[PDB]
Amino acid sequence: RKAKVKATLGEFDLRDYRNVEVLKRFLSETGKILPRRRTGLSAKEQRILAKTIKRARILGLLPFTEKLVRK
């Protein structure tokens, strides 16, 4: 239990593909859509999120991929 992104957030719309400030938090240091293990999301939730992020990337708002910066 490193940190669950379900808790660090109030309530939001999972079908909202424009809410970058939320969505941003379900991706990794790379653009990669986090695993349900780190998202804490339901089984149904994760599939919905999944599509919303895809929609939003295609819109230009979220990244397909990043580059890992050795921090």
Partner 1 sequence: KRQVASGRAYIHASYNNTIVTITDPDGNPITWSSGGVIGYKGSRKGTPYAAQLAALDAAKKAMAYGMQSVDVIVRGTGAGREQAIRALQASGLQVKSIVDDTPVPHNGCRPKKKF
Tokens (6 digits) for 70: 């050795």
Q: Which of 5, 19, 22, 46 binds RNA (CB under 7 A)?
A: 46
- 9 vs 58, beta carbon nearer RNA: 58
Q: Which of 1, 2, 44, 67 binds partner 1 (CB under 8 A)?
A: 67
Interface with RNA in residues 3-32 (CB under 7 A): 28, 30-32
Q: How far apart are CA 63 and CA 29, in angstroms?
A: 11
Q: How far apart are CA 30 and CA 54, in angstroms?
A: 15
Nearest to 24 by CA among 48, 54, 53: 53
In angstroms, what is the minimal distance from the CB of 25 to RNA? 14
